[PDB]
Symmetry: D2
Subunit: 385 residues, 4 copies
């Protein structure tokens, strides 16, 4: 289960670089030079890294410092062959963003947030990024009167439309991916789930430029089924990017390494991504627990990749097993993929076998055989057949 | 705080008619004649009732029985002046729907579910309903292999498109409202939230025919902010109907009377509905607890209406208070409603006060004053100023 | 992974016998004769069955009917070799228990609940049960004024003390196990968790007669760590019985087959039970989903046993692996088992290496190596080393 | 609703002193001199403040600095009349505590944690504290193998027994209160709820020295009913202290001002505390949101006190209302307070009206009238009768 770059595994600079500061604790690890992270991740078999503007260039840097930080970063990519498929803006750390970025009540902050993002889009395009992610972690509220949500969605649409106008006017190929999160650090965050983000996108001026970057832990933070939400994003044609990690149910954002947390949901996610032929980066947005030293950071990163590859093998064995293929037919998954009424409405209305002469009790008595199917899946996941 | 029919309060036959059967207990109350519910609700000041097909006509009824049930029902509406603004199909009680209705794996069940709905749409139009609600309570799964969600969404789109084709071919004015629910009775239910339903609707053949019927308890069952989700539905122009009740956080669907559960969220919901000028029915989808006798059923129904009216008065006093209007300006809610960059992208890019000369520390040091605003709201809710 | 009776796997009559009625649906399966369940479970390798009084003898039965039901049941145990290690009272289904049994506000109901339990304790002793379980599923409330909780705990202590007085006066060996549940069917249930039940027991007249019967899904329904709670019950010497099943986080009580739901927590539970040498029944309190027919019921029951045995093998391989034993030392699990200050308080107060000369930064810089340990556990669970 | 010191309102130095650093954001406010907090809180009507050792004396301070910090603090208490009823140890911020304090796997860290606490107990006694709080925020784990919970509970019992041995050997009157929390910053925290802490205390060498310091938000973080848990703590005689704040369901620890979050649960909490005659400090453990400036900090603190006083008035009006007293009798709250079987077990066994001649259907048909009672409570809370 050794990763190679063709597996497309990517890591944020902020993941292995996390110093371990949490709400109740100081840092447990020194800061990492982005150059060293690139080298250490390449040695593990990663394909690429991603960054926030302020991860790569310290906030407030001068032009000459900015140029030296990028030049050092570019040399580490050249030395390793690592790519930069995705980038994003930090619109959450600085105190100026305390009431939001694009939806801050203060107009001058909203304008500043847009300028900060536009500057980093240029940098991301230069480094080769195909996707620009927006995480509105500060867009939201802790109380009901502090944010008019219809007004905030107006401001959010304006911000995204202007960013779409900007990349069009430069002839950039980059697309945007919205990363939903239901809460934390705000009491409730706007566009809290995959669904809310997909619905918002359909009201933008150029919807085709925008998709979702769903994160395993963020949907599980709302108790939602992450493979189900990914399926709806695939159905809509909007899975531009994905964040992989682990999460133990409804609580603070844990960002455990992928495969920790809900192991079965991870299996069904990997099964769906491979079956659907998702071709984007397999991006890990995780935090090595602050109990770990620097050797534990890299063990945690390696674990993400390994667990993905183990699940990929087991899911593929599951789908290829003729006994599973037989069980899927017994459970009528083939019938689910058949059109309900390709004969059309009138034919359905006149079809007496659909109502007047439908034997509802005979239909009701037919078991679905889902438990035998699910136990075959569990045996395949555990390597027990 | 006495309701009148112009307040547009509506109740499902299945709410005050609930016999008190739960997963662990037998019925604690006798069944109610729909006629008596209409009379008792009218006496309380309700505007109308809603129904499932099988609430009004017992499942399996003959044509002559069906006609007598409707004739009795119609006479109770005539005697009281009560309206029927909304109707829906029971696609969840009969064992034939155990794997779903529109997305059942068995094609013959999906066709039957469509025919059952189409039959009731006719009845609902005859009784005057403006909205037909779809609650896919059985569309979902308890295990990952039992439902391919992309296939199920294909079947769901087909079902809704055919229903839209049907009402168009009859020249009906009725529109559809999807009622989301994240789980129960299925382990996870498809279109689990307001957002997922809004996103799905945008892929239907005629999206303008479909909106959402969000329920307070269903979004709170996912830990989501119900006023926020209602705001996004209003923003999208899709709040066709609403279900009001109470719910104590993330657990089984409690269906408490409106105002119980999260009292502050109820206040902010009523504030939003009145401020936005929502003109649909104020529909209560609640269950009088099975501890109650028939007198407790009607006290519970009266409580729903009363609590709405109390919250309506307090929210209106909050918005009209000049000290609150002053606090809203101090918190820059006026600036949130102003366009971020009506001067356009180029002007924003050249505006040095948006970036090069933006004093980020002065902006960051400005408090939002949200706590004083929120305490004014709490004083208004409690009648303590 | 074939179970045998020496594995001590037990099932409630109400589990495989569940007809599939849920809050929104009618039964999908016919009722089962308890005799047939005993035979079918024995054929699967089960050790025993458990029952509610009303599972074995239909409520309201005459003495002659009661005797024939028991005689038939006893013959099925004799024919199979199955045991009856545990029994319990149904104090939740009949409408008389709608406000509780032992803590019903109506005193005459509380007295009836006690008499109903005492009658079944006699029957359980006759059938050989070692444990009598109390599940106060109706003890609780949906609103704050309806139950004074200090008064209710007074009544609950009185009920349990009287039951302890009863079994002592008959010279019975049977002990009581309280089964906690945080909510459902009541809005909140008294003694909601393992901890609350353990604390309550310490106030009973004869605490040694009472322990806990924790259920996987019930603690996960509160977002709690079930292996952690089992550990505290073992630490207190109170794990008299256990209910095994699966549950997907915070939502209604799913009662999935064991191993479904949180697979990793199931692994750590089995590891703890085997390491601690728990010698009680491995009891499954699960519901075959109502999508299943009778063949799916037995496949689901077999899956419970199989998954336990797979996890038992993987946990044992994990603990016996010398590389894991090395990682546990690296993570200082050996030091955790050493007394903190066996030298005593004064020696600790005078030990300068505990404070004045403790190198806090050197200690802080030592990584715990938990991630490498946890990835070894994951590799062992998945069969990937 | 103006607080006075006889209302016993207390605040942690760390509450109004919180600089606004969260997992995703830098500080939004400057640090506060503890002296200024004492003065500002006294001016608001507070009775007292509480502290962590490291709140009052910066970590690593020399003896002469330590003495000057305390002397300044003591003068602010003398100038204001403020008391210090409670103190606690910071065993969570420094990286040395990253795997816990009393239950850290490293023995030398456990010994250091004990010495750090013992030093602060001396200081707390000098300042007059009656309660010493233990919050084991780092005692726990993110993975299953990293902590043997039976071993950790052994170490926790040893730590608490040694602290009890220490205060006894000095003749101190101070008692200990354990503050439970289910998760955050650890994935799961040991003794996660009021119940688990009460059960643990009963295994300590001198149980009478230890009680609980429950926090509104911490039990709600597990979806539990906080008034119910407080009632069980009162029933056990262990409510030594309480932390008041607000929390919106199951998510990260919000620490909103008291009264925000679940308003009805706050009402029932205040009703219970006043009815039970709780005489300890009404301590607020809250964080003014980081959107606020220093004026918003004090408005937030004032709001805590005001909301408590409003709820106190409404709860008292509720209990004194003769129509409520009539409804409580109708709902048989009087019968709940009556002993179930003061006639004894034998008399119960021979009482034919408890079983043989109990009319179960007549009992079942009697409604509890809980909804009318609960609507009276809601009318009293809202000032709407
Ligand atoms: O892409 C933006 C990223 O910013 C991070 O700091 C957030 O915590 C992530 O959830 C997000 O993926
Ligand atoms: O509109 C359909 C209705 O069916 C009911 O039985 C469900 O429980 C409701 O949530 C829903 O509103
Ligand atoms: O032991 C009593 C049993 O009664 C069942 O019907 C409950 O649902 C179980 O959780 C419990 O184990
Ligand atoms: O008493 C100890 C205190 O430490 C704080 O920093 C925790 O966040 C509180 O929950 C706790 O009350
Ligand atoms: Mg992310
Ligand atoms: Mg509804
Ligand atoms: Mg159970
Ligand atoms: Mg606290
Ligand atoms: Mn995250
Ligand atoms: Mn509902
Ligand atoms: Mn259960
Ligand atoms: Mn807290």
């Amino acid at each position: 289960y050794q990763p190679t770059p063709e597996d497309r595994f990517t890591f944020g600079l902020w993941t292995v670089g996390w110093q371990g500061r949490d709400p109740f604790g100081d840092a447990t690890r020194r800061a990492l030079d982005p150059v060293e992270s690139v080298r250490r991740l390449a040695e593990l078999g990663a394909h690429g890294v991603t960054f926030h503007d302020d991860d790569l260039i310290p906030f407030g840097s001068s032009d000459s410092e900015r140029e030296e930080h990028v030049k050092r970063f570019r040399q580490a990519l050249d030395d390793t062959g690592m790519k930069v498929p995705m980038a994003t803006t930090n619109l959450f750390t600085h105190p100026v963003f305390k009431d939001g970025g694009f939806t801050a009540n203060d107009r001058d902050v909203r304008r500043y947030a847009l300028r900060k993002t536009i500057r980093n889009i240029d940098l991301a395009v230069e480094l080769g990024a195909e996707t620009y992610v927006a995480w509105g972690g500060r867009e939201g509220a802790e109380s009901g009167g502090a944010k008019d949500v219809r007004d905030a969605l107006d401001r959010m649409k304006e911000a995204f439309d202007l960013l779409g106008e900007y990349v069009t006017s430069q002839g950039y190929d980059i697309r945007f991916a919205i990363e939903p999160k239901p809460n934390e650090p705000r009491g409730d965050i706007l566009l809290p789930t995959v669904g809310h983000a997909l619905a918002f996108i359909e009201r933008l001026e150029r919807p085709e430029l925008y998709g979702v970057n769903p994160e395993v832990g963020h949907e599980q933070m709302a108790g939602l089924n992450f493979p189900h939400g990914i399926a709806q994003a695939l159905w809509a044609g909007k899975l531009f990017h994905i964040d992989l990690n682990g999460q133990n149910g409804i609580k603070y954002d844990q960002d455990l390494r992928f495969g920790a947390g809900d192991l079965r949901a991870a299996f069904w996610l990997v099964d769906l991504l491979e079956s659907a032929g998702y071709s984007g980066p397999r991006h890990f947005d995780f935090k090595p627990p602050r109990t770990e030293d620097f050797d534990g950071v890299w063990a945690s990163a390696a674990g993400c990749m390994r667990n993905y590859l183990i699940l990929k093998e087991r899911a593929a064995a599951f789908r290829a097993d003729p006994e599973v293929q037989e069980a899927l037919r017994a459970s009528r998954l083939d019938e689910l993929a058949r059109p309900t009424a390709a004969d059309g409405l009138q034919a359905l209305l006149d079809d007496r076998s659909a109502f007047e002469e439908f034997d509802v009790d005979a239909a009701a008595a037919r078991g679905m055989a889902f438990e035998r199917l699910d136990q075959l899946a569990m045996d395949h996941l555990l390597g027990a057949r």
